[PDB]
Write a structure and sequence with these properties.
ribosome assembly; chaperone; TPR repeat; mainly alpha; 283 residues; nucleocytoplasmic transport
Length: 283
């Protein structure tokens, strides 16, 4: 006999690790809410999130799609809208990719910009305690940063037709440089763009800065880039003829996971080219 109750339990059940029953409680919750209820968006996004951790991508994509359909603008309060995240996940889950993917990315990103601006205005009113708001903004900026860099990768891969693809990236890395200068991935995204522009030496400067933001950090410490990022880092370092750096990176990856295949072939191809440079020293 309470709408918000089932949702708050579903989220708790999702953090409990129990995804099966969480999917059940959430799916039942949306029934009482209705197709055009007041919480429809916030519920459907949760249904989508759960079916991602499960494995059903087809159902999760439709849930997120249905979550958009009620509120396409994405203006509505997260508590009832479900936030901008669904747009972002409709961009990731999209099997089509390309302009279809970039479309959803941009919608999500614009909302994030709005929520950040609205929260920066909340700091001015200063509601007793600043600090929670400062952290909540840091999360939104990082998410926005994650999204920006993700769009670049699409323009660095799938979409490479119009000249539009170049200027779009140059602006994306500009904004990404502003909102998350502490994030290693951004400078990897910067470096990657510079490589497409053949500005080789500029790619070096970014990769060096990206490295210097975590290379000293403890493996345990949170800050270090995820495994598939550091693998992409290696692939860059070799491209800009920075093999010596790549050796130290791979070497760390092997210890963290002695099962990865591409990492070994990378670390090998690294020392190979590095060796070819040594054979050039004498003759």
């Amino acid at each position: 006999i309470n709408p918000k109750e089932l949702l708050d339990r579903a989220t708790t059940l999702l953090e409990e690790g129990d995804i099966e029953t969480a999917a059940k409680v959430a799916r039942t919750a949306y029934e009482h809410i209705g197709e055009n209820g007041r919480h429809a968006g916030a519920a459907l996004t949760l249904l989508g999130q759960i079916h991602v951790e499960l494995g059903d991508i087809d159902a999760a994509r439709n849930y997120y799609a249905a979550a958009v359909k009620v509120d396409e603008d994405g203006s509505l309060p997260e508590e009832l809208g479900g936030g901008p995240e669904k747009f972002l996940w409709l961009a990731q889950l999209s099997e089509e990719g390309g302009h279809d993917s970039v479309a959803w990315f941009e919608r999500g990103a614009t909302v994030l910009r709005a929520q950040i601006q609205s929260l920066m205005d909340s700091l001015e009113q200063r509601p007793l305690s600043r600090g929670q708001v400062e952290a909540a903004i840091a999360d939104k900026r990082r998410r926005l940063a994650e999204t920006l860099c993700a769009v670049v990768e699409v323009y660095m891969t799938d979409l490479s037709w119009e000249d539009d693809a170049e200027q779009r990236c140059e602006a994306l890395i500009t904004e990404a440089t502003m909102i998350a200068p502490e994030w290693p991935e951004t400078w990897q995204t910067v470096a990657n763009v510079r490589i497409s522009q053949e500005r080789t030496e500029e790619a070096r400067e970014a990769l060096r800065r990206s490295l210097g933001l975590w290379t000293h950090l403890p493996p345990e410490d949170p800050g270090v880039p995820p495994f598939p990022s550091r693998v992409s880092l290696v692939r860059l370092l070799i491209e800009v003829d920075m093999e010596e750096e790549a050796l130290e990176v791979t070497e760390r990856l092997i210890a963290e996971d002695d099962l990865s295949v591409e990492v070994w072939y990378l670390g090998g191809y690294a020392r190979y080219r590095l060796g070819e440079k040594e054979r050039e020293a004498s003759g």
